[PDB]
Amino acid sequence: PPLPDIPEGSPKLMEPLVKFVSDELGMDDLKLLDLREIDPPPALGPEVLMLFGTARSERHLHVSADRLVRWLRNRGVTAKADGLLGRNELKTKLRRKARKAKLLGTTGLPSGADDGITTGWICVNLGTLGWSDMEMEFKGFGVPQSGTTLVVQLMTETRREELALEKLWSGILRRSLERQDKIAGK
Protein backbone atom coordinates (compact mmCIF):
# COMPACT_ATOMS: atom_id res chain seq x y z
CA PRO A 1 0.00 0.00 0.00
CA PRO A 2 0.97 3.68 -0.22
CA LEU A 3 2.46 5.82 2.56
CA PRO A 4 0.73 8.49 4.67
CA ASP A 5 0.97 11.85 2.91
CA ILE A 6 3.22 14.34 4.70
CA PRO A 7 1.17 17.38 5.83
CA GLU A 8 2.45 20.48 4.06
CA GLY A 9 4.85 22.30 6.37
CA SER A 10 6.31 19.38 8.33
CA PRO A 11 10.01 19.31 9.27
CA LYS A 12 12.58 17.62 7.07
CA LEU A 13 12.72 14.66 9.48
CA MET A 14 9.09 13.68 8.79
CA GLU A 15 9.68 12.12 5.37
CA PRO A 16 12.53 9.75 6.31
CA LEU A 17 10.78 8.79 9.55
CA VAL A 18 7.64 7.53 7.79
CA LYS A 19 9.82 5.63 5.32
CA PHE A 20 11.84 4.12 8.17
CA VAL A 21 8.91 2.88 10.27
CA SER A 22 7.33 1.35 7.14
CA ASP A 23 10.13 -0.03 4.95
CA GLU A 24 12.45 -1.11 7.80
CA LEU A 25 10.27 -1.84 10.84
CA GLY A 26 7.30 -3.53 9.17
CA MET A 27 4.20 -1.77 10.49
CA ASP A 28 1.00 -3.13 8.94
CA ASP A 29 -1.10 0.06 8.87
CA LEU A 30 0.33 3.58 9.09
CA LYS A 31 -1.85 6.68 9.43
CA LEU A 32 -0.37 10.14 10.02
CA LEU A 33 -2.88 12.48 11.68
CA ASP A 34 -2.49 16.23 11.21
CA LEU A 35 -3.58 17.77 14.53
CA ARG A 36 -1.84 21.15 14.26
CA GLU A 37 -5.14 23.11 14.23
CA ILE A 38 -6.31 22.75 17.85
CA ASP A 39 -7.21 26.04 19.54
CA PRO A 40 -5.95 25.03 23.02
CA PRO A 41 -2.60 23.30 22.47
CA PRO A 42 -2.93 19.76 23.87
CA ALA A 43 -0.78 18.48 26.74
CA LEU A 44 1.91 17.14 24.42
CA GLY A 45 3.24 20.29 22.73
CA PRO A 46 2.09 23.06 20.39
CA GLU A 47 1.38 21.08 17.20
CA VAL A 48 1.30 17.28 17.33
CA LEU A 49 1.63 14.91 14.36
CA MET A 50 0.61 11.57 15.88
CA LEU A 51 1.80 8.68 13.70
CA PHE A 52 0.07 5.35 14.38
CA GLY A 53 1.58 1.98 13.55
CA THR A 54 0.67 -1.66 14.10
CA ALA A 55 3.13 -4.29 15.34
CA ARG A 56 2.93 -8.01 14.66
CA SER A 57 3.49 -8.99 18.31
CA GLU A 58 4.55 -7.43 21.60
CA ARG A 59 8.10 -8.70 21.05
CA HIS A 60 8.20 -7.15 17.58
CA LEU A 61 6.94 -3.86 19.03
CA HIS A 62 9.55 -3.85 21.80
CA VAL A 63 12.34 -4.36 19.25
CA SER A 64 10.95 -1.91 16.70
CA ALA A 65 10.42 0.75 19.37
CA ASP A 66 13.97 0.39 20.67
CA ARG A 67 15.21 0.26 17.07
CA LEU A 68 13.51 3.58 16.32
CA VAL A 69 14.92 5.32 19.40
CA ARG A 70 18.43 4.42 18.22
CA TRP A 71 17.63 5.54 14.67
CA LEU A 72 16.57 8.99 15.86
CA ARG A 73 19.54 9.17 18.24
CA ASN A 74 21.91 9.19 15.24
CA ARG A 75 20.34 12.47 14.04
CA GLY A 76 20.29 14.46 17.31
CA VAL A 77 16.66 13.83 18.25
CA THR A 78 16.52 12.38 21.77
CA ALA A 79 13.21 10.50 21.91
CA LYS A 80 11.77 8.96 25.08
CA ALA A 81 9.74 5.79 24.53
CA ASP A 82 6.89 5.61 27.06
CA GLY A 83 6.59 1.86 27.47
CA LEU A 84 10.06 0.65 26.51
CA LEU A 85 11.74 -1.08 29.44
CA GLY A 86 15.47 -0.70 29.94
CA ARG A 87 18.15 -3.36 30.09
CA ASN A 88 18.63 -3.22 33.87
CA GLU A 89 15.04 -2.15 34.53
CA LEU A 90 14.10 -5.64 33.33
CA LYS A 91 16.75 -7.44 35.40
CA THR A 92 15.40 -6.16 38.72
CA LYS A 93 11.86 -7.19 37.77
CA LEU A 94 13.14 -10.65 36.85
CA ARG A 95 15.34 -10.90 39.96
CA ARG A 96 12.51 -10.13 42.39
CA LYS A 97 10.15 -12.46 40.54
CA ALA A 98 12.58 -15.39 40.52
CA ARG A 99 13.73 -14.57 44.05
CA LYS A 100 10.20 -14.77 45.46
CA ALA A 101 9.61 -18.07 43.66
CA LYS A 102 12.73 -19.53 45.30
CA LEU A 103 11.44 -18.67 48.78
CA LEU A 104 7.80 -19.63 48.14
CA GLY A 105 8.77 -22.67 46.08
CA THR A 106 7.09 -22.02 42.72
CA THR A 107 3.63 -21.17 44.05
CA GLY A 108 3.10 -17.88 42.19
CA LEU A 109 4.53 -18.65 38.75
CA PRO A 110 1.11 -19.57 37.25
CA SER A 111 -0.40 -16.57 39.10
CA GLY A 112 1.81 -13.85 37.61
CA ALA A 113 -0.74 -12.49 35.15
CA ASP A 114 0.45 -8.86 35.42
CA ASP A 115 4.18 -8.37 35.99
CA GLY A 116 5.09 -5.09 34.28
CA ILE A 117 7.47 -6.77 31.82
CA THR A 118 5.10 -6.81 28.82
CA THR A 119 3.23 -3.99 27.08
CA GLY A 120 1.25 -3.66 23.87
CA TRP A 121 1.60 0.11 23.44
CA ILE A 122 4.74 2.25 23.18
CA CYS A 123 4.59 6.03 22.69
CA VAL A 124 7.83 7.42 21.25
CA ASN A 125 7.58 11.14 22.03
CA LEU A 126 10.08 13.05 19.89
CA GLY A 127 9.12 16.40 21.43
CA THR A 128 8.90 19.85 19.87
CA LEU A 129 11.77 19.95 17.38
CA GLY A 130 11.35 23.09 15.28
CA TRP A 131 10.61 26.25 17.27
CA SER A 132 9.76 29.54 15.58
CA ASP A 133 8.25 32.91 16.41
CA MET A 134 4.50 33.42 16.07
CA GLU A 135 2.65 36.63 15.15
CA MET A 136 0.54 38.13 17.95
CA GLU A 137 -0.59 41.54 19.23
CA PHE A 138 1.15 42.69 22.42
CA LYS A 139 1.68 46.35 23.31
CA GLY A 140 3.78 42.05 26.81
CA PHE A 141 7.40 41.37 25.85
CA GLY A 142 7.44 39.44 22.56
CA VAL A 143 5.71 36.65 20.67
CA PRO A 144 5.05 33.16 22.12
CA GLN A 145 7.26 31.00 19.88
CA SER A 146 5.59 27.76 18.77
CA GLY A 147 6.92 24.56 17.27
CA THR A 148 5.87 21.27 15.71
CA THR A 149 5.77 18.24 18.02
CA LEU A 150 6.25 14.71 16.68
CA VAL A 151 4.76 11.68 18.45
CA VAL A 152 5.01 8.10 17.17
CA GLN A 153 2.51 5.68 18.73
CA LEU A 154 3.38 2.04 18.05
CA MET A 155 1.02 -0.62 19.41
CA THR A 156 -0.37 -4.04 18.59
CA GLU A 157 -3.56 -4.82 16.68
CA THR A 158 -5.43 -5.84 19.83
CA ARG A 159 -4.32 -2.73 21.72
CA ARG A 160 -4.93 -0.37 18.78
CA GLU A 161 -8.65 -1.22 18.79
CA GLU A 162 -9.32 -0.91 22.53
CA LEU A 163 -7.77 2.54 22.97
CA ALA A 164 -9.00 3.91 19.63
CA LEU A 165 -6.85 7.02 19.89
CA GLU A 166 -7.38 7.74 16.18
CA LYS A 167 -11.04 8.66 16.66
CA LEU A 168 -10.28 10.44 19.94
CA TRP A 169 -7.90 13.01 18.46
CA SER A 170 -9.95 13.21 15.26
CA GLY A 171 -13.05 14.18 17.22
CA ILE A 172 -11.04 16.64 19.30
CA LEU A 173 -9.82 18.24 16.07
CA ARG A 174 -13.20 19.01 14.51
CA ARG A 175 -14.52 20.23 17.88
CA SER A 176 -11.68 22.74 18.24
CA LEU A 177 -12.25 23.91 14.65
CA GLU A 178 -15.97 24.57 15.06
CA ARG A 179 -15.33 26.55 18.25
CA GLN A 180 -12.70 28.54 16.34
CA ASP A 181 -15.27 29.51 13.71
CA LYS A 182 -17.56 30.87 16.44
CA ILE A 183 -15.02 33.55 17.38
CA ALA A 184 -14.27 34.57 13.80
CA GLY A 185 -17.85 33.98 12.65
CA LYS A 186 -17.30 32.38 9.25
Binding site for RNA (CB under 7 A): 11-13, 59, 63, 66, 70, 73, 75-78, 86-92, 94-96, 98-99, 129-132
Q: Give the number of C-alpha atoms closer than 13 A to the C-alpha of residue 77, restricted to the C-beta side.
A: 24
Strand partners, 150: 127
> Any contact of residue 183 with other proteins (CB under 8 A)?
yes
Please report the sign of the dihedral spanned by the C-alpha atoms of residue 77, residue 78, residue 83, residue 87. Answer: positive
Run of H or E including 47: strand 47-48
Coil/strand/helix, residue 132 = strand
> Any contact of residue 137 with other proteins (CB under 8 A)?
yes
Select the residue interacting with other proteins from 144, 157, 174, 177 (CB under 8 A). 144
36: amino acid identity, one letter:
R
**Residue 67 beta carbon to other proteins: minimum distance, rounded to whole angstroms:** 18
Of the pair 100, 173, the CB lying nearest RNA is at 100
Please report the sign of the dihedral spanned by the C-alpha atoms of residue 76, residue 82, residue 87, residue 89. Answer: positive
Of the pair 18, 79, the CB lying nearest other proteins is at 79
Contacts with other proteins, residue ranges (CB under 8 A): 40-46, 50, 80, 82-83, 114-121, 123, 125, 131, 134, 136-138, 140-146, 151, 153, 162-165, 168-169, 172, 182-185
